[PDB]
Amino acid sequence: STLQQDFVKCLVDNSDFPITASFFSPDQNATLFKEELESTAQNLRYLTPSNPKPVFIFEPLYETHVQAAVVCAKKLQLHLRLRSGGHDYEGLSFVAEDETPFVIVDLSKLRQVDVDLDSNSAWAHAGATIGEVYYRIQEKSQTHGFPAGLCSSLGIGGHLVGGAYGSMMRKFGLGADNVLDARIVDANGQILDRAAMGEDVFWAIRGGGGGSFGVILAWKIKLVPVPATVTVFTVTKTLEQDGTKVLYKWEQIADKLDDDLFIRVIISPASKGNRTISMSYQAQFLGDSNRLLQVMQKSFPELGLTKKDCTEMSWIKSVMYIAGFPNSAAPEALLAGKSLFKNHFKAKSDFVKEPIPVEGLEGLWERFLEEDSPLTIWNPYGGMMSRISESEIPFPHRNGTLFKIQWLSTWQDGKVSEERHMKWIREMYSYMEQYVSKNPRQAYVNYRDLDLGTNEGETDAREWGAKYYKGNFERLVKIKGEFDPDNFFRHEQSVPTKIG
Ligand SMILES: *Cc1cc2c(nc3c(=O)[nH]c(=O)nc-3n2C[C@H](O)[C@H](O)[C@H](O)COP(=O)(O)OP(=O)(O)OC[C@H]2O[C@@H](n3cnc4c(N)ncnc43)[C@H](O)[C@@H]2O)c(*)c1C
Ligand SMILES: *[C@@H]1O[C@H](CO)[C@@H](O[C@@H]2O[C@H](CO)[C@@H](O)[C@H](O)[C@H]2NC(C)=O)[C@H](O)[C@H]1NC(C)=O
Ligand SMILES: *[C@@H]1O[C@H](CO)[C@@H](O)[C@H](O)[C@H]1NC(C)=O
Ligand code: NA
């Protein structure tokens, strides 16, 4: 009479299928269970043996199975963690702290995507990757797209609920700025659409972050116009090529460029056996290369972009280009729904309100050259992002935001070098405090960082709540208290039911 036998009995006692082959446990098959656990889990840091493991994993095949799983987990007082794409930076979708026992409900079998051009919209289920959504859209039309993530393997279920920015945010805003409806499962196992859940809950799931406001089954997204021809480029500058001053110029102008123009910077050490710092300016321009060169000559001639560097292509090709696909790959590669690689990593995030001066940058370089594999990605805001209020949706990082920084340290060897890398990024984060947003020091919720504080820990939730959501946190808490009073949907940094 095991926990899983009770779980299955509760499942089948629901009037809505075999299910055995949708279960994974150490007792069934330890080898299979491990592989299912690791399958979509992206951060290898959270797959080491030291990490708490779920008693079992359940992969529902229909929406009714998701309902039954909620009902049964609640009835057996079994802690639930939801997983769609598995990209959580802190492994929150497959690793739970001090909630023994816990179960993973993995939604990777619900990947239906239905595109309807006539209404300029689409329904995408939680287990679909954004790459799959992108592919299905372009399949119907070369002049439609969607402004969500840059990474192809991001799961819908955990992506859009955090806001979902990408290379088209300066023109169309966030993925969460472009949704119409959704279907969610509440704490009582009811399926609610926007009409049933009400406007407050629908607001909450447009930036509130995953794991807090019920199980998202599907989003109804609003398609956006993209041109038949999109231009991209990647221009690389090192410190020996006036790199620091060039980056400083980028800080001053990137958020002020034409709405069609998105130029992010990818920054990492590079071999010159010494190292230098290398900045890759990667761009997507919703227009032709002729117009682009004119835009660049006026506002960023320091980059030294030439026609030779520009490549014109379809929107879907540009998506794969930015995502770092080889030119040898085809759009159908997006259908595999697999990440390009995996490693152990620790990430943090920042928002910049005033340009980091060159001396601040040089101090950053000194630290980067002290680390094995540091990497930082800077993403320009402005454009449409400045024209939306901070309280429109829970995502608060709008006007005044020059750009968002993603801090990264990665490694291949797990617990061998983990401690060193963790300490390095925390030191660097502390160094940067003087240069980034203050009161609060803003952070992106889909870049989970437990260092900011947890519900259970001694850090008050208002402190880290203010970083992710700013002035929207209090309202999120109120909604959470009303929607899930028993705190069934919860994790280390879930929106609490109350404050105090
Ligand atoms: C790995 C990775 C992440 C990226 C990348 N680039 C991004 C970008 O260009 N724009 C972005 O906006 N975000 C980017 N991120 C971060 C991702 O957005 C986040 O990592 C998302 O949370 C990923 O979602 P998903 O892939 O589904 O990860 P999961 O671990 O499955 O879930 C995350 C989080 O949400 C909860 N949750 C999952 N599924 C559901 C459902 N159906 N309903 C409610 N809540 C859900 C989980 O509990 C978990 O806490 C680029 C790369 C390479
Ligand atoms: C338990 O599950 C594991 C994992 O799928 C199974 O082991 C694999 O079996 C397949 C089929 O021959 C092989 O291709 C793999 O090489 C095996 N795994 C590895 C990597 O060794 C196994 O079949 C299952 N055992 C039972 C009892 O059915
Ligand atoms: C937007 O931010 C800029 C830069 O800080 C500021 O000057 C301006 O007042 C802000 N605009 C609005 C509408 O508040
Ligand atoms: Na706390």
Kindly give the residue spans of alpha helices, DSSP state H, lying in 141-277.
156-159, 169-172, 194-204, 243-253
| Pocket mutation for ligand 3, best pick of 354, 399, 438 (most atoms within 8 Å of C-beta) | 399
Beta bridge partners of 81: 104
C-beta of residue 454 within 8 angstroms of C-beta of residue 492: yes
Residue 424 burial (CB count, 10 A): 18
* Residue-wise burial string across 320-335, b where 16 or more C-beta atoms lie within 10 A, e elsewhere: bbbbebeeeeebebbe
Q: Is any atom of ligand 1 closer than 6 Å to the C-beta of 85? A: yes
C-beta of residue 414 within 8 angstroms of C-beta of residue 45: yes
C-beta of residue 461 within 8 angstroms of C-beta of residue 499: yes
Spatial separation of the C-alpha atoms in residues 393 and 268, rounded to whole Å: 33
Maximum separation of any 2 CA atoms in the chain, in Å? 73
Angle between helices 315-322 and 130-140 (to 10 degrees): 160
Residue nearest to atom 14 of ligand 1 (CA): 149
Which of these, 10, 8, 33, lies nearest to 20 by C-alpha position? Answer: 8
User: What single string gives the DSSP state of each residue in 343-361?
Assistant: BEEEEEEEEESSPPPHHHH
By residue count, the chain amounts to: 500
How far, in whole angstroms, is CA 467 from its chain's centroid? 16
Whether 431 is catalytic: no
Fold of 111-228+314-340+440-500: 3.30.465
Q: Which CATH class is domain 229-313+341-439?
A: alpha beta
Task: Identify the three-state secondary structure at position 114.
Answer: strand
Around ligand 2, the residues with Cβ closer than 6 Å are 29, 31-32, 35
Please tell me the distance between residue 496's alpha carbon and the centre of ligand 4 in angstroms: 9
Task: Identify the three-state secondary structure at position 421.
Answer: helix
Q: Which of 89, 281, 447, 468 is catalytic?
A: 447
The region, left, alpha or beta by phi > 0 then psi within -120 to 50, assigned to residue 486 is alpha
Angle between helices 63-75 and 3-12 (to 10 degrees): 130
* Sign of the C-alpha dihedral computed for residues 391, 392, 395 and 400 taken in this order: negative
Q: Which token pair is 239?
A: 């410190």
Which of these, 92, 164, 97, 96, lies nearest to 134 by C-alpha position? Answer: 164
Beta bridge partners of 56: 103
Residue 306 burial (CB count, 10 A): 12
Task: Identify the three-state secondary structure at position 331.
Answer: helix
* Sign of the C-alpha dihedral computed for residues 499, 216, 390 and 469 taken in this order: positive
Q: Solving technique for this entry?
A: X-ray
> Kindly report the CA angle at 202 between 155 and 495, in degrees rounded to 5?
75
Q: Which CATH class is domain 1-110?
A: alpha beta
In the chain, what is the straight-line distance between the N-terminal and C-terminal CA atoms, in Å? 41
Q: Which token pair is 230?
A: 């999109």
Element (H, E) at 207: none
Beta bridge partners of 321: none
Please tell me the distance between residue 500's alpha carbon and the centre of ligand 4 in angstroms: 9
Please tell me the distance between residue 30's alpha carbon and the centre of ligand 2 in angstroms: 10
Cis peptide before 331 (omega within 30 of 0): no
Please tell me the distance between residue 439's alpha carbon and the centre of ligand 3 in angstroms: 17
Percent of the chain as helix, strand, coil, to the nearest 5: 40, 20, 40
Q: Is any atom of ligand 1 closer than 6 Å to the C-beta of 278? A: no
Going by the DSSP 8-state scheme, the letter that residue 213 receives in this structure is S
Supply φ then ψ for residue 452, to 5 degrees: -75, -20
C-beta of residue 290 within 8 angstroms of C-beta of residue 314: no
Q: Give residue limits of the domains in the chain.
A: 1-110, 111-228+314-340+440-500, 229-313+341-439
Which of these, 91, 166, 94, 90, lies nearest to 133 by C-alpha position? Answer: 166
Residue 154 burial (CB count, 10 A): 29
E strands, 296-399, are 311-313, 344-352, 374-380
> Kindly report the CA angle at 224 between 219 and 230, in degrees rounded to 5?
130
Report resolution (Å) to 1 decimal. Answer: 2.1
Which of these, 256, 228, 396, lies nearest to 313 by C-alpha position? Answer: 228
Which ligand lies nearest the alpha carbon of 35? Answer: 2
